[PDB]
Design a protein around this ligand. Structure first.
Ligand SMILES: [Zn+2]
Length: 252
DNA sequence: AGGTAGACCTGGAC
DNA sequence: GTCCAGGTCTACC
């Protein structure tokens, strides 16, 4: 799930779990649990706590309990659902939080790439995975100034830059390729080669692109298809070790 | 010093 | 077999 989807999950999951108290935590794939390292400690510390809120930082959901925060990243396929403890579990359910009301928050992930970290609340923002997180892309803290400062300081591509969570929080691959196309900038361009005008323009498309989706694709996944703006076939290559799509005529 | 390219994970799809 | 994939996690200068 990408930032806008995580935001929808955050909004819709909260009312379904707020005020419930954890009676048990069952883990079927311990590797998902990254902190505490022992999945038995992770399970024991959460029992007895009540869910008080649910926030989002980048693509990370932050479950707020009485004493602890549970920080969860779903990666590509992770999913949460609330259902009855009386019903059989769906496939690929790796972690289940059982509440005292007979309902359960179930985490499913066919790829098992998702992660969970639990810490005393006041410690979460200063520990992994939230600690080096850059600013929300839709906040005033993510500014052209900030983006320029990071761009002129690295030898990496503009795409590698946008993909860096310390630069901006949770801006995924699809949004990076769509924003670069809307801004008219090739993804393989050295970040340091961008002009002020290009930076400002990239910043504005990033916000509109992800802003529109938080509330149809030009290039992502459209390779071999004609560009929606000019008809030239979209091209796909690998930049920053990821699938990268762009219009060769319109992006410079 | 620390910026940075590769590697790790995992299973379904080509 | 071979191929992705996010936010790490090494080594490597
Ligand atoms: Zn075009």
């Amino acid at each position: 799930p990408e930032l806008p989807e995580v935001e929808t999950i955050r909004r819709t999951l909260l009312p379904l779990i707020v005020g419930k108290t954890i009676e048990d935590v069952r883990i079927f794939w311990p590797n998902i649990i990254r902190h505490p390292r022992d999945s038995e400690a992770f399970a024991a510390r959460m029992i007895g706590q009540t869910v008080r809120g649910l926030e989002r930082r980048g693509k990370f959901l932050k479950f707020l309990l009485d004493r602890d925060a549970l920080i969860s990243h779903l990666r590509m396929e992770g999913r949460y659902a609330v259902a009855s403890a009386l019903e059989p579990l769906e496939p690929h359910t790796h972690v289940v939080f059982c509440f005292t009301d007979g309902s359960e928050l179930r985490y499913r992930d066919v790829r098992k790439f998702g992660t969970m970290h639990v810490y005393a609340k006041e410690e979460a923002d200063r520990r992994p995975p939230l600690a080096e997180l850059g600013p929300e892309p839709l906040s005033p803290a993510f500014s052209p100034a900030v983006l320029a400062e990071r761009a002129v300081k690295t030898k990496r591509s503009v795409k590698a830059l946008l993909l860096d969570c310390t630069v901006v929080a949770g801006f995924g691959n699809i949004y990076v390729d769509e924003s670069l196309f809307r801004a008219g900038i090739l993804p393989g361009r050295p970040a340091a080669s961008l002009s002020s005008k290009e930076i400002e323009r990239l910043h504005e498309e990033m916000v509109a692109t992800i802003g529109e989706a938080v509330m149809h694709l030009y290039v992502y996944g459209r390779q071999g298809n004609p560009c929606k703006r000019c008809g030239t076939p979209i091209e796909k290559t690998v930049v920053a070790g990821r699938g990268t799509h762009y219009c060769p005529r319109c992006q410079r």
